[PDB]
Design a protein around this nucleic acid. Sequence first.
RNA 1: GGAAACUCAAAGAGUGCUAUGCGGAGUGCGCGAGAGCAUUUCCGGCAGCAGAGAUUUCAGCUGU
Lengths: 460, 59, 166, 109, 182, 458
Amino acid sequence: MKIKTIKRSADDYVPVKSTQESQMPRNLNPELHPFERAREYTKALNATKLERMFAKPFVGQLGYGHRDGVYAIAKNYGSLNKLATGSADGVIKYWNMSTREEFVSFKAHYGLVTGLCVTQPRFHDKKPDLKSQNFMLSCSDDKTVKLWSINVDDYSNKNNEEGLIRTFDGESAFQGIDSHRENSTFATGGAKIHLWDVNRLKPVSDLSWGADNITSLKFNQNETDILASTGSDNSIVLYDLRTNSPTQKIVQTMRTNAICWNPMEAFNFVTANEDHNAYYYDMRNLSRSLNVFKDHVSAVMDVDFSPTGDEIVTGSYDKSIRIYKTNHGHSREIYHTKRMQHVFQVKYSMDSKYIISGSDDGNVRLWRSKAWERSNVKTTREKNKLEYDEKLKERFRHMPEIKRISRHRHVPQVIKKAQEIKNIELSSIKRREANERRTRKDMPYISERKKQIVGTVHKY
Amino acid sequence: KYQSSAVPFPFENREQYERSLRMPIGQEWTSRASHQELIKPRIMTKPGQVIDPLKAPFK
Amino acid sequence: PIEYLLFEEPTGYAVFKVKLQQDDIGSRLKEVQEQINDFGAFTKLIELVSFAPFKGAAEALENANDISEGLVSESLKAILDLNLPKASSKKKNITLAISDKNLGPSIKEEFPYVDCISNELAQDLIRGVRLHGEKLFKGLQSGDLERAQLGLGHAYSRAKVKFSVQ
Amino acid sequence: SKTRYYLEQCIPEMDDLVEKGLFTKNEVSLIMKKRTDFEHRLNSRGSSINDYIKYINYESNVNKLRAKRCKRILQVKKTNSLSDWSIQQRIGFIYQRGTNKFPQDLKFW
Amino acid sequence: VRKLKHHEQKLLKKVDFLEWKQDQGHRDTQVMRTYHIQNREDYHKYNRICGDIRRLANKLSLLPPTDPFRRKHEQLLLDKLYAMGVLTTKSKISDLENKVTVSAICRRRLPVIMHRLKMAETIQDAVKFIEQGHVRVGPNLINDPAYLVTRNMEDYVTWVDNSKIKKTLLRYRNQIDDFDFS
Amino acid sequence: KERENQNKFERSTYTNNQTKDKKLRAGLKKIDEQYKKAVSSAAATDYLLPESNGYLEPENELEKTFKVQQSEIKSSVDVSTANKALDLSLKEFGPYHIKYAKNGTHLLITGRKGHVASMDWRKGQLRAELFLNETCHSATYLQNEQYFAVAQKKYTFIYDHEGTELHRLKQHIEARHLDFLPYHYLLVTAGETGWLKYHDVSTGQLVSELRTKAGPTMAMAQNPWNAVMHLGHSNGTVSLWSPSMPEPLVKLLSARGPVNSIAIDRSGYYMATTGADRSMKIWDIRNFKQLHSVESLPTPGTNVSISDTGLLALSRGPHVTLWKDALKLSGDSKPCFGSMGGNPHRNTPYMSHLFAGNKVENLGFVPFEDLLGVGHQTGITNLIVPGAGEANYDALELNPFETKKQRQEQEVRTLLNKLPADTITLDPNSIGSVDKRSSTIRLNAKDLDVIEEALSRF
RNA sequence: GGAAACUCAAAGAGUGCUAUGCGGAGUGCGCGAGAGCAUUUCCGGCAGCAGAGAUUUCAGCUGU
C-alpha cells in the first residue's frame, strides 16, 4: 500500500534568503477562480469611476495670451513643440510649447490676420537652413501676404535676420493660407483663390470657379498636389494643381467654416459648417457625407484630425471644444472652461496627445486628448493595468450604469439648455414628419448623411 | 440593470454579444502571455515624437 | 529626437543612448519633472552605452580646461566617433544632447554628420543624470566622484589663478 | 511579475519535447521546478552573476541530457522539433540578460 | 486597516471596520468604561427599562388630564423613581424624558455610589472591594456589583466588621477599638 | 494543442442550437479565434503547476483503503505532516465547532460553554483566546485572521485579532449558523428565528432581512461558486437563497424530517445532504437532478463536508467515513458500505475512523493540505486524508505563506473589488447577458346567396 | 506600580532596492550594408580521406 501526500517542503515557496522574491504558484482553474463576470464587471465599474475622478484635462495656457483674440493657429508639421499663432488685432507670434512662451512676436498687419501657416521654403539661390531658423507666413486683411523668419533656438549648430524676409502684394483682400508641403508653393483664399510660390511676387495661377470669395482652404497631407477650399457660396471646391484647375464643387445648406484633410486616409476630409455638426466627407464620392458628427449647439468654427487619423477635434462658436471618435458621430469628450469664449481655432498637436484651443478672448490653451491619462513614462505594471482596464471598459461599455458613468460630463448650463431644447424640437420635427409619412404617398426617405447636401456639380 | 437593454451596434443579436463576452481577460482566468497579447490597444504611439502622414508605397 | 547625450564627469566622459523620448509639450508638468527624481523611472529613459575615463589626472585637468574654454579635446573626439553612427547625406542627421551652445559649434565642425541639441529638454535630462550620477554606471568606473572633483577643483582653481609653488 | 512571463515563455518546447517520447511529465515538472527557482533568483532583487552562471550551467547540462536521450531513445541526431534550437537560444537570452544587468565583470563577458 | 491612498479613499468612503452606524457611537461601551460595568448586556437591560418608562409616560400623557387612574399612576411612578433614587428631585413629568438616563440608572449602582461617598477612591477599586466581600447594606453582605441601591439605603452602606480595610483605617486614625472585634 | 483539460477550461454560452456584414464577420472570427487561443494557452499551465495531489491505493487484492490506521499513515508519511496532524484535548468546555480560514493558515475553535480561540495551528501562535461566559453555538472568520464573528447566546458579536469585541449586532437577534461570502464581504446569519439575514461587513450595513417562513434553519451551507446560501429547514426542504429577492430561489426537497447538514462542492456542481431520516443525498445543482440517494445509513448522519477534490465526509455520530469518487454521475459512484462478495462496482469508503466515545459536531477540511479538522466533544483532531486538498493553490487570491504587507494589500484589493450584494445570482454568468425580453435580433429603425349578391351595394 | 527580548500582535513614517521587454547562409530587391520582403538554393544526414583543434570538436573532397 502506497501513501503519499502533499510535499509542501517550505523551500520553493518561502525563499532561502531574505532578499529574493518568493514564488506566487498559480493555478488557472475556473474551479479555483469563481466569479469571472461579476468580478471583471466590478473592475470595469472601478475603472470608469477612476477615469471620472482622474479626468483633469486642462494643462495650462501659454504666455500671457494675445491682445484681441486668436483667429489663426498653425502647428508646424515637422517639429513637435512649437506653433504659430496670429490674433486679429494684427499681432502674430511663434510659441514654443515646451517652456510655454513665445520665441518672438510681431505687429504683422494693420487689420485682422486671417490666415497663417508654416513653411519649409526652397529658394533657388540658397540652401534654405530649416534648422537654425524657422519660417512661417501669413495673409491678412490689408491685401498682403508676408513670409516671415523666426530665429529659433532648438539646435546649437551655430554661434540675425529676424522678421519679414519678403512680402507679397495682392489687389484684393485675403482670407486663407496653406502651403503645398513640397516645392514651396502655397495658396491663398481671398476674393479669388491664387496659387503662388515664394520665388515670384505674382500669382502663378488664378484658380476660382466664378465670382465668389474663398473663405478657407487646406492642402492635403499626402497626394500633396490636391487641395480643398470652402467658399461663401456655402460650397466645397476641390482643386488639383497637377491639372492646375478646380475639379468639383458641392453646395451644402449652411456655410462651411473650415476643412481639414485626413492624414491617414488621404481622401477623406472633415468639413466644419455652421449647422451644428461636422461632416466626414469622402473625396471620390462627394454625394454622401459618410459621417456626421452631431453633438453641438452652435456653429462649428474649425476642426482638425489627430495625427493618428482616427480621432478628430472640433471647436465651435459656443464656448466649448469637443473631441470625436471617427467612427461614432457623437462626442467622445467635451472640454470647456469659464474663461474660454467663442473658441475659434482648435488644432491637434503632432503627437496626438494635446489639443491646442485658441479662443476669442485672447488666450490659447493646452488640453490633453485622453483626458484621464498622464504624460510620464510608466512602469510596465502600470502600463498593463491602465491598458487592461481600458480594454475592460471597452468591452463592458454597454452595461447601463457603466454607460451612464462614462457618459456623464458637466456641460455649462447654456449648452445644457440649448441641447435639451434642440432635442425637444428635433423630436417635434420627427413626429410631424411621421404624421406626413403616415398619410402621404411618396415622401421618400433621405439619409441623414445625404440631408445637408443641396447640390453637386459633376453628378457622376 | 445588469443585463443590457438591446443588442449593441456592431453585433446583431444576443448570441453575438454573449460570444463576445464569453472569455474573461484578467490574469486570473487567463495566462500572462495570453493576457498581455489579448490586451493592447489598436493604436500604439511612441510618446515623444512627431507623427508623419503616411506616404507609402514606392519610396 | 535626442538619440544620444554626452555627460562630462570628473573621471571621464560618458555617452548615453536614449531609449524612450521624454514628452515635449508637458515638460513643465509635475508628473514629468518628478520622473527625473525617481531613479527607477529615469532609467526607463537613459541607457549607459559608453564611458571612457581620463587616463591621468593631468589629462583630467586638461579636459576640464578644454571644456571650460569650449574646445574639443582628443579623448572627447575618440569617444564621439566611437559611439556616434555615421549618417547618410542629409537624411537622419544623428543627434547629441550636450550641455552648452559653445561646445555646440566646435563638435559640429569636428563632426559634420552630427547635430547638437541644447534646449530645456536636453538640460532637463542632463540634470537628471547628474542627480542620479554614479548609480547609472553600476560600478563601471575607477573613481569616486566627490573626491575626484575635489582634486580637480583645487587643480583647476590653481591653474586658473597661477598660484605660485615657491 | 515578469518571472511568470518567462516561465510560460518556456512551455512550448517542453510541450513538444514531452509529446514526443524523450522525457515524461513526471520529470519535466522537476526541471520546470528548478527552472522556476532559477528564474525567481535571477530576476529577483539583489541577484548575482553566480546565479546567472549556475542557470547557464544547468541549462547546458539539460541540453546535453536532451541530446543524450535524443540519440539513445530516438536513435537520431535531432528530432527537428522546436526544442533543439530553443534551449541554446534561451541560454543566449540568459547571457544577454546577464550582460545587460551586470556589465561589470569581464569573467561573465 | 491600511490608511488607504487618495484614490482608494475616494473609491470607497463608506467603509469603516471599526465604527458602524448601528453602534450608535459606541455609547454602551463608553458608559460601561465610564462606570466599570462587569458584564455585557447590562447597558441594554438598563436601556430597555429607560425605553419602558418613556413608553409608559407617553401613554400616561396620552390618557386625558382628568382621570384619577392617570394622575395617581403618574404620581406613583414619579415617587417610585424618586424612591429608587434615579432622579434627585420630584420634578415634572418632562424630566421623564429629559432626565432619565441609562447613565443615571447606572449612577445608582453600588460601586458608583461607593466612590460617590468616598468609600473607595475609584470605581475599579470599589468593584475590587465588593467582589472581595467587604461591604454590606444594612445587615446583609453584597457580593455582586449589579445591586443598585434605593434612596433609603444610601446611608447604611458600610463595610462589614473584621474587614481589614476598616481595621486599617481605624488604626490610621488610632481609634482602633478592639472590644467590638474589628 | 491537445490540452486534455480543455474540457475543464471551456466556458459555455447561451446558444441557438452565417452573417452578411463583413466587418461583423471578421470581428466574430477574430473573437472566437482568440478564444480558442486563450483556452489552449491557459490549459498549457499544468506543466507549470508545482506538485501533484496526494493519493493512496491498495496495490494488492487483500488490504483495503478504509481499514488503514491513522497510526500507520502517520508512520509512513513525512515528519512535517505527521507533526501537523494535531490533536488538541480540551475537556472542561463543551463541544468544539471548527472553522479554518479560507487558506489553511489559522483555526477558530468554539466550545459550546464559553471558549473561543483563534490560533495559528501550523506554528503554535495564540492570537485571541477568550472565555465569554454565555454559550457560543458557532463562529467563523471574516476575511482574514484579523476578524472573527462568534454567534453567542443571542446576540452575534464580531471580534478583532487580539480578542477585543467590535460589534454587538443589534440585529441577528439570535444565530445558529454563520457563514461568510468572501468575495461579496457578506456575513450571513441564520438561526432559530425564521430570519436569514445578510450583513455587508465592510460598510457595516444590513442588506437583507429575508423571512424564511419555514421555522428555524437547521443547517446552512454556502455555494462557493455562485454564492447562494442553501438553508435546510425542518421540513426536509433545502431552499437556496439570494439576498436580492425575498422569495427563496429554488426549493429542493432532499430528505424527510429535518435536514441535519448540507455541504456544497467547491465547483458548485454537487450538493451532499444528510437528514434525520437516516438518509444522504447527492444532488446535481446546475441541472437540479437528484444524483443518487444513500438510504438507511445505520445512524443519523450528523455532518457532511466535501473537500476540494470531491471527497465526501460523513460523520455518523462517533464515526468519520470518507468516500472518494462519490461525486460522479454513474451508478458505480453511489457510496456504499460493502463490496458484496467483493464486488468491484461499489464505493467501499476511501477511509474511515471511529472515535472513542465523543460525538463529532462538525467536520471541516483544511484548504490546502491533505488533512481534515474534525471537532468533537473533548476537542479537535486533524485526520491525515491523503487526497483531500488542492496541492496547487493559487497565490493571487489566497496564500498559505502570506506575510503582513501582502495580507493588508490582498484584503484592500478584495475590498475594492467587492462584488455588490445584488449580483448574487443562481448562475454567475448572467450579468453580461441581454434581457430575456427585448428580443434577440436587433432592428436598426427601418421596420418598426344569389339574392344577397343582388342586394349588395346598399 | 517602574525596567531587560531574538517576547509577539497591530498600525505609521523614513532609508534603501532596478521597480526593470525555423537557423547558417546563398538568392534579387531596401541608399558597403542589414533595418524588411522570399526560400528547396545547399544544408542543420551517413561513414571514410587528410589539414587542424582538446577521447570529442572544426576545415575542404568520394559516394550518399
